[PDB]
């Protein structure tokens, strides 16, 4: 075993590797969404900028887990990053509904990971997940919630143009 | 018809937050009373006046942060009457701090109960929120009030109350 | 019996001030409720959340100024239960501002009554305090809310609500 | 019909760009793996960790510029799975830069093929794009990796690896 | 019972007092190691500086636990500080292996203390330990793992001089 | 024998090692006194700060002697640090009387060490001790004498609060 490994269970190591893959998957999906809004027949630059940023942040989420794996003396194990569900994402509202479903799936994954760590009495790993993931996920779901509400409010056409400029770009 | 953001948030936890919101508001109202008691012409302790107004304001912030939490998790804020404080007149500086210590310990037990409920429903995010934002401020507040009581017993009545008020509360 | 500072301050006027203090806190709590309703994920109007949060804080300040006045005059603050707000849910931006107009007019009438009472007891300093600090703020608040209602009717539902919230309430 | 912006852009060139995007992402993921390998407690080379993290990031930028180019020309981005890196463990600093040279040359050949395809369809825009942003960075990248390999052979294993990591990669 | 004491078990109070002694014992060991590297026949100034700093940090760890004891209304009980295991600590690599051993020993003590807190539903004591101690320890252990790896890599003689200058002095 | 050793007797080397232990024992006593004044039922923050600072200075005194040991080519030999004489230290005036006792005890130890140096014609060790230790000790003793006198003058209760604020906190 690694010289630094202490109170770190093989199932927890495995759970971190699974979460790294899911974070990379979310990153790639937002990347797809970002460049969909950059198409000449879509042309919502606020969404393009917003989802690009989201993609970057999800990559940082993966890196912090890779960093965590090494601190605890686990070994990073990488799998393929599955291509996103769709090639085209529809409206601003459609894209946000996809984002909410993705964020809730990631959140349930992190809640299962936390539960795993608690079951093995990994107090460090519980603290780490609670401090860096669980509140960002709640805040992210709430933010997407609000976007969906406002996108239904502003409607289609001019409303989308304005929401894109005022709320995603600025 | 669950909230679109709601995930791993029990109805009993929702109700527990609403109960804590009322308790925080109640504490704010009690400090407000105490603050204006020390502004009476026949009491006239400006340090205490300023101290307890600030305590009132902080308790209102504690309530707001739980209202914010309730909305983040997709629960619904339900407001009740704020009960008038226990007394119209609060006696000496020492008497007011003995009241505060009893209040803080009451609020603390309520936060420990609320944390216990969250843990019993495996609401790991709610555990972290309460630990991060409430449990250590409560411990620091109780210790601070203990030190105040100790010092108010030491300085005694009359000149000591005037000095303590100027040196430690103002 | 009376405070060493008390001069020309009738017990009915002392009682009137305690009743105004309660009304101010009641209005604070109502705006607080409204503020957190606009922060719900299924309403999500951040401009209104911010506006009503500030209104809540202001009304608490109006209560504090009265508690401070009570003590200046040597009256004694007497606090009562702060009644829960009328509604749990407040509907549209328009519905919320219509509630505010109603609330602000109720508070105004109460202050005008209190001023009446002060004058009936020839409490000139109390008349001056009420006129100086409350009667014009009240007039200005009711005008401001009237303008809000007019503009919320003009912009309509949907896009207009989003724009009004961002342009007028947030900024 | 075709995109309103599409002019002188062949479907095989579109396909080529999509294949290059996947390759750039593949390269990015490989450098990511290498980066975190050097962060292991039993490898502990902080310069190389920082260096390969930065290489991972730049490759992702290379991918983004081609997606941007795809949309500029009125083509459509088609994403495929990103294949996991070929190894879990990357050996020495020298071994890692040997993998990097192999990878950089493979990507260069794919860019030279893409350029040949552009020229074959008389896509002057695309030739110029590839030559301006890709062909020279790739030559510079290969030269840089070549110099790293030579220097890592010069310095030894052991002390030399620590010194090179701190003096050359941590910069 | 202290006026401030609430939800603080005697066994948790005892464990805090045990931890304080352990923190002070680590401090004294680091102090010894620091002054060994200052001997004219050892003369590694980077190590002297580094281990002095480690000695100072461990004393701070002890202080934070004494402060916590008082905050919770426990009473600080102090025991002899046992002299370090050796008078002489060998090579840079020998000293770092001692450090990894010590840090892993301390960490197990903190994981046990956290376990005790949890067994008594001391929610605030769990938060305290995880926030201030559990992640610091995992960072400390990883950093020492990294030192050992690099000290094996650089070898003895010239490598030790350079490591001491380039990594420990800076 | 150390390459650096010249005109340094074994008995002087032994006395330096004795002094180091005494400096560390004083440091630990001051640490105990410091954290007693931090208890919720004592709560004298000026004393807490003052005795913490004294604790830090005594550790520095120990360090300077370990440095001197190494400069002269003696070898540092460390012994257990004996727990302080009391767990509880009474009044501000009680703690200062303990301090005068401790400081006079240390000073006699330094005067004996100086005597030993002189008996071995260790001219540089006489200079070291007189320069760094003998006048500091006389200043320390006078300052504590002054505290005791002023603590008798101010009396208990209000006087202790004011002295703690006005003299020890500043
Ligand atoms: Fe994420
Ligand atoms: Fe890193
Ligand atoms: Fe996310
Ligand atoms: Fe509170
Ligand atoms: Fe808010
Ligand atoms: Fe409180
Ligand atoms: Fe008002
Ligand atoms: Fe005031
Ligand atoms: Fe108003
Ligand atoms: Fe590239
Ligand atoms: Fe772009
Ligand atoms: Fe490249
Ligand atoms: Fe420690
Ligand atoms: Fe302190
Ligand atoms: Fe440590
Ligand atoms: Fe000393
Ligand atoms: Fe030194
Ligand atoms: Fe001293």
Numbering used by the authors:
A (entry chain F), E (entry chain L), F (entry chain L): 3 to 172
B (entry chain K): 2 to 171
C (entry chain E), D (entry chain J): 2 to 172
In the authors' words:
In this study, we prepared a triple AjFER-E25A/E60A/E105A mutant (MF), a double AjFER-D129A/E132A mutant (M3), and a single AjFER-E168A mutant (M4) by site-directed mutagenesis; heterologously expressed the three mutants; and further performed detailed structural and biochemical characterizations using a multitechnical approach. Generally, numerous experiments have implied that eight hydrophilic three-fold channels in most ferritins are considered potential gates for the entry of metal ions into the cage with the assistance of highly conserved residues, such as Glu and Asp. As previously described, the negatively charged residues Asp129 and Glu132 are located at the three-fold pores of AjFER and play a pivotal role in Fe2+ translocation to the internal cavity of the protein, at which Fe2+ ions reach the ferroxidase center. Accordingly, we prepared the M3 protein by site-directed mutagenesis and solved the crystallographic structure of the mutant at a resolution of 1.98 Å. The diffraction dataset of the M3 protein was integrated into the monoclinic space Group C121, with unit cell parameters of a = 192.83 Å, b = 130.95 Å, c = 122.62 Å, α = 90.00°, γ = 90.00°, and β = 119.40° and with twelve monomers in the asymmetric unit. Being mostly consistent with the structural features of the D127A/E130A/S131A ferritin variant in BfMF, the inherent hour-glass shape of the three-fold channel in the M3 protein was even wider than that in the previous holo-AjFER protein because of substitutions with relatively smaller alanine residues.
Ferritins are well known as an ancient superfamily of globular proteins that are associated with the storing and detoxification of iron. In addition, they exhibit a capability to oxidize Fe2+ to generate Fe3+; and ferritins facilitate iron nucleation as their mineral core for storage inside the protein cavity, allowing the accommodation of up to 4500 iron atoms. Previous research has indicated that the marine invertebrate Apostichopus japonicus ferritin (AjFER) shows very high sequence similarity with other invertebrates and comprises known conserved functional domains of both the di-iron ferroxidase sites of the H subunit and the iron nucleation site of the L subunit, suggesting that AjFER is functionally similar to M-ferritin. Structurally, each subunit of almost all ferritins is composed of a characteristic anti-parallel α-helix bundle (helices A–D) and a fifth short E-helix (with the exception of Dps proteins) pointing inside the protein cavity. These subunits assemble into a spherical structure with octahedral symmetry, resulting in 12 two-fold, 8 three-fold, and 6 four-fold channels.
